[PDB]
Design an enzyme around this catalytic site. Sequence first.
Site, PDB file in Angstrom:
ATOM      1  N   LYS A  92       0.846  -1.227   0.000  1.00  0.00           N
ATOM      2  CA  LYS A  92       0.000   0.000   0.000  1.00  0.00           C
ATOM      3  C   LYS A  92       0.873   1.265   0.000  1.00  0.00           C
ATOM      4  O   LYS A  92       0.399   2.292  -0.420  1.00  0.00           O
ATOM      5  CB  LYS A  92      -0.920  -0.012   1.231  1.00  0.00           C
ATOM      6  CG  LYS A  92      -1.977  -1.112   1.244  1.00  0.00           C
ATOM      7  CD  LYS A  92      -3.116  -0.832   2.245  1.00  0.00           C
ATOM      8  CE  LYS A  92      -2.631  -0.732   3.686  1.00  0.00           C
ATOM      9  NZ  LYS A  92      -3.772  -0.723   4.657  1.00  0.00           N
ATOM     10  N   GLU A 118       8.226   2.533  -5.846  1.00  0.00           N
ATOM     11  CA  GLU A 118       8.236   2.091  -4.437  1.00  0.00           C
ATOM     12  C   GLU A 118       8.367   3.323  -3.536  1.00  0.00           C
ATOM     13  O   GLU A 118       8.897   4.312  -3.987  1.00  0.00           O
ATOM     14  CB  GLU A 118       9.386   1.096  -4.217  1.00  0.00           C
ATOM     15  CG  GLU A 118       9.588   0.615  -2.774  1.00  0.00           C
ATOM     16  CD  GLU A 118       8.424  -0.167  -2.169  1.00  0.00           C
ATOM     17  OE1 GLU A 118       8.636  -1.293  -1.688  1.00  0.00           O
ATOM     18  OE2 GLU A 118       7.307   0.367  -2.151  1.00  0.00           O
ATOM     19  N   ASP A 143      15.226   1.197   2.411  1.00  0.00           N
ATOM     20  CA  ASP A 143      15.843   1.368   3.744  1.00  0.00           C
ATOM     21  C   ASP A 143      16.853   0.224   3.864  1.00  0.00           C
ATOM     22  O   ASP A 143      18.001   0.445   3.520  1.00  0.00           O
ATOM     23  CB  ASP A 143      14.733   1.436   4.803  1.00  0.00           C
ATOM     24  CG  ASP A 143      15.214   1.746   6.203  1.00  0.00           C
ATOM     25  OD1 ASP A 143      16.408   1.680   6.403  1.00  0.00           O
ATOM     26  OD2 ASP A 143      14.384   2.060   7.070  1.00  0.00           O
TER      27      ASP A 143
HETATM   28  O1  YCE Z   1      10.990   5.041   7.709  1.00  0.00           O
HETATM   29  C1  YCE Z   1      10.059   4.417   7.556  1.00  0.00           C
HETATM   30  N1  YCE Z   1       8.782   4.963   7.766  1.00  0.00           N
HETATM   31  C2  YCE Z   1       7.612   4.166   7.555  1.00  0.00           C
HETATM   32  N2  YCE Z   1       7.779   2.801   7.112  1.00  0.00           N
HETATM   33  C3  YCE Z   1       9.130   2.259   6.892  1.00  0.00           C
HETATM   34  C4  YCE Z   1       9.589   1.022   6.485  1.00  0.00           C
HETATM   35  C5  YCE Z   1       8.673  -0.151   6.156  1.00  0.00           C
HETATM   36  N3  YCE Z   1       8.206  -0.097   4.771  1.00  0.00           N
HETATM   37  C6  YCE Z   1       9.270   0.009   3.775  1.00  0.00           C
HETATM   38  C7  YCE Z   1      10.277  -1.154   3.876  1.00  0.00           C
HETATM   39  O2  YCE Z   1       9.559  -2.358   3.897  1.00  0.00           O
HETATM   40  C8  YCE Z   1      11.318  -1.116   2.760  1.00  0.00           C
HETATM   41  P1  YCE Z   1      12.885  -2.020   3.148  1.00  0.00           P
HETATM   42  O3  YCE Z   1      13.348  -1.706   4.487  1.00  0.00           O
HETATM   43  O4  YCE Z   1      12.745  -3.464   3.070  1.00  0.00           O
HETATM   44  O5  YCE Z   1      13.791  -1.599   2.110  1.00  0.00           O
HETATM   45  C9  YCE Z   1      10.979   1.109   6.466  1.00  0.00           C
HETATM   46  N4  YCE Z   1      11.332   2.319   6.831  1.00  0.00           N
HETATM   47  C10 YCE Z   1      10.244   3.014   7.096  1.00  0.00           C
END
Ligand code: YCE
Lengths: 212, 216
Positions: free
Chosen positions: A77, A125, A129
């Site tokens: 989402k 996307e 992170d």
């Molecule tokens: O800073 C943030 N604020 C709000 N939601 C998140 C998340 C979770 N959703 C993204 C990840 O699922 C991407 P991934 O870490 O796998 O690249 C990571 N950072 C934050």
Amino acid sequence: VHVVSRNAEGVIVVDGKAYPMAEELVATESVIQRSIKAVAKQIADFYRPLSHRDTHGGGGVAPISDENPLIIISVLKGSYIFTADMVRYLGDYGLPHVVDFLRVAQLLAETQFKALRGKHVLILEDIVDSGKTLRYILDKVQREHQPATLKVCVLADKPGGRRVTMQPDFVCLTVPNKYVIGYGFEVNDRFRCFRHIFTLRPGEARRYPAHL
Amino acid sequence: HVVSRNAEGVIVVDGKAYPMAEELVATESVIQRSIKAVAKQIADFYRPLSHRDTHGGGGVAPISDENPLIIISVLKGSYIFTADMVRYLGDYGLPHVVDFLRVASYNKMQLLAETQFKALRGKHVLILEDIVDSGKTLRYILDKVQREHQPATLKVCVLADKPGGRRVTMQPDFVCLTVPNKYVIGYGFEVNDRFRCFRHIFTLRPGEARRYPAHL
Ligand SMILES: O=c1[nH]cnc2c(CNC[C@@H](O)CP(=O)(O)O)c[nH]c12
Ligand SMILES: O=c1[nH]cnc2c(CNC[C@@H](O)CP(=O)(O)O)c[nH]c12
């Protein structure tokens, strides 16, 4: 443009609205939209010259066009607001494109597009992170769809959070190494509707423990 | 905005040609004004209400960030409308959360994607949908959400109402715009996924409906 202050409770106020859950402002709406539109121009400039499989006129290769558009896969989402804004900018810059969605949490929803072989595919996307979510999605899309090329455009890059190698091809904004909220970013689905991105006060990620 | 036709009789809005368009229905400014006005109506209607307390595992509590209004947005056509509406709802201070469901017709209806929210019993639920035309899609969604989630109340907000298309009784509680009894494109409305990115809503020239026959 944008009046940013703090009230007597020390709470950040942007254009008269208080954000008691926020530690610091990262980016105002004006900065976010300028950054997205700038990357939309980069995306349109990069793709409009390209050609890929012709599924409209019986092969072989034909330019990206309304007949054979760029294929965009948006990750639900988190990316829906970013995607809504980006596609309108891509339209402004005359990039022919179509959008389908995959939902990840585990894959919860699959794409309905079934003719991506030999096509240029772009993933939209919310944030990179750790890099793990995109490594999972990129592997899945490459193996099931066999695209001609696969690239990633993220609204936000948190370079300090990486656990695995992941360098998006297009990045609108760089965020601090902190939990971000606003403009699609959330705490249990709260705060996605903010027009600005903020960092979250420490420990507030547990504010809403109840499953919706 | 400037809306005119070029020397080829093609509609031009703000210097951009729309050769697939028969008529302009609404400019971006009219659409956005209309959505923000409905956002104020939705905020004014729900702000004072209360519903099941799942945050304090209690009985009943006011709509709040702890117990937000539940919004279910109908993919794919409603995603742009929803992105804009939620930001206007936030401007008016309405606490809410959004999940998605997808539906399709084979005409008879079938679910393509389910919502992931699992605690909606006794909650106020608002469906955000792109258009009510025949009314069959929303009759299916409302019947399914009602029996499966048992919400306290179930209401519908549509970006567009095509009044002449009705084949089953369906009047959304909230309507941003009324469109002519014609195939509309732009601002989420598509022809095989084309034209959704347009900032304006138009009627489609009838010969353009099968321009993109190949499945994506
Ligand atoms: O800073 C943030 N604020 C709000 N939601 C998140 C998340 C979770 N959703 C993204 C990840 O699922 C991407 P991934 O870490 O796998 O690249 C990571 N950072 C934050
Ligand atoms: O005008 C239109 N432009 C583009 N797409 C459509 C549709 C299909 N999607 C909505 C319907 O499935 C709702 P339903 O008819 O069941 O209420 C109906 N009208 C239009």
